[PDB]
Each structure stands twice: as structure tokens, then as C-alpha cells.
Amino acid sequence: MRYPSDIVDQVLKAGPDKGLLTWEGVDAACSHCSRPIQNGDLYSPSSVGAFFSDTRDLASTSRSICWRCVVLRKKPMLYGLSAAVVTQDGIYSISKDVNKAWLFTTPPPAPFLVVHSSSTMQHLSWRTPVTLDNRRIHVRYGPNLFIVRPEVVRKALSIADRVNEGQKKWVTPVYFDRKAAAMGHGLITRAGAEMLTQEEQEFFQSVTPGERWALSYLMHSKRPEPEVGECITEKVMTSLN
DNA sequence: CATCAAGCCTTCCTTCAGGTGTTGCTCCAGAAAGGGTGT
Ligand SMILES: [Zn+2]
16 A cells, blocks of 8 residues: 555555576666565566557666566556546546546545556556556656645536536536647637636646646546446456466 | 910720639657567
8 A cells, every 4th residue: 555566455455476596686666667576575676678668657767577567567457447446445447538537526535556558558557656546646647747625626517517517518618638738738718708706717827737637538528427437457467367 | 686375175994704613631749568589
């Protein structure tokens, strides 16, 4: 519940691969997940391929992967956590917009860990911190480390439901990009320029990029009700074995 | 060799063409597993 690699044996039960070396000597942190490798725990020397391009998100330059993050670099872990929230009892999916509606509005009370892929297969699990508090959520989205406050998401959603109550067409006040890629991601629309007051506009610039990315999955004409995502920890474990 | 004549009127544009067709984007921005084989 402290390091992102803890879910290897806390969220989902797993063990070392038994071809891993035993650490002898002084303390050194794992290159992935920033977990200190003590004396006696199993570790692997660093054998990343040339296709690994996340050297900028490595926690340390010790060139040693802890066994939990050896499990975390496995391909079934890589496509199993392409969109997943890992609570203290299981791994659930956030692929649907109703699942992100559940995650960023009334979050689960566990100290979870949120990963989401901005591409096909990405190293997501180890390079994000564990969110200890529901109010402050660390979301990994591709090369982006995002922080989402569900209270600010609730305030923006209440603002949007106020300015779009009674109207026939649900027009968004501020445009949000799902990929977080367009220039106008966070830019105020003309309808939102005419239908929001000044302090609401400064609020919509003042939100964090993670809240913008979350609102991108929950600001559209059909509004997703918070529905808990389907539990996928059985699918990941079966794939892992 | 000097002036006096040292213009006057009126015309002073008319119709119509006064766009048509197409184009109106393409692609990819991953990393590992599992095989080879070349130094
Ligand atoms: Zn680690």
C-alpha cells in the first residue's frame, strides 16, 4: 500500500520468478517503483531491451529490478493494467466512462493505484505513486503523471449540470481532450464563454491537468453515472499464470 | 500697319454575361517474447 509494486502480493498474490539474484551489500533503490532493495530479497539485474523508452521515469540508476517490479514488467501485467484501478482488495477496470465516473466521483476508500494507457502497451504500473488519500489521486496516463481531486471534479460537474439544466442540447462549457493532446485541451468554448461567469472561468483554468483529463472522460452530452468497474484481478492472475 | 471677330448646342451609352467541377488527407507515434545468427 506504500510502493506501486506492493500490488504484486497485496492487490494480487504472486511470488518471485526464482531465477533472480539475492542482494548483498549496501542499500540501493529499485530502478522501477522506487522501492529500496534490502539484504536478502530477490532481485534481477537490468535486462531491458532497446524498445524500453521509459528511462526518464526510472526512480534510480541502480540498474536492478526488485522481484515485485520484475512481475510488474511482465506483458500480462502490461496489457492487464492498460486501464485499471488497484484498490486494497482487487483490480478493477476504468476503461468505460462510467468506471471513470465512479473513480473520479465517490472514489473507493482504499489506498488504490490508478493506471491508464495513452497508447497500445505502456509501462504504467511502476512509475506512478500510490494514492493514499481519495481526495488526491495519482493517475498514470502514458507519459503523464496526473493528480486528480474528486472534489474539484464534483465542483466542475455541478457547474456543468447547472449551466446545462433545462436546455435541449447538452453543450459542453469547456473543451477537454481525452488524449490530453489537442491545443484546445482546457480552452473555454464560446458557449462556456457566454454562459459561465468570471470566477467559474478562472476555476476552469485553475484545475490541474489530471482533472482536465478526467473531465475529458466525463464531460459530454450523455453523462455517465458512477458505476463500479468490473473486477479484473481474476483475468490478470489467469493471464499471469 | 493697329483692332474686330477672339463660337454656339447637343451629344454627355445601350444588354448581357454577373462560373462551372474537384479537392473536401494519408500515417504514426509500443514494448516484450520468442526465435535466429554473428561476432
Ligand atoms: Zn520495484
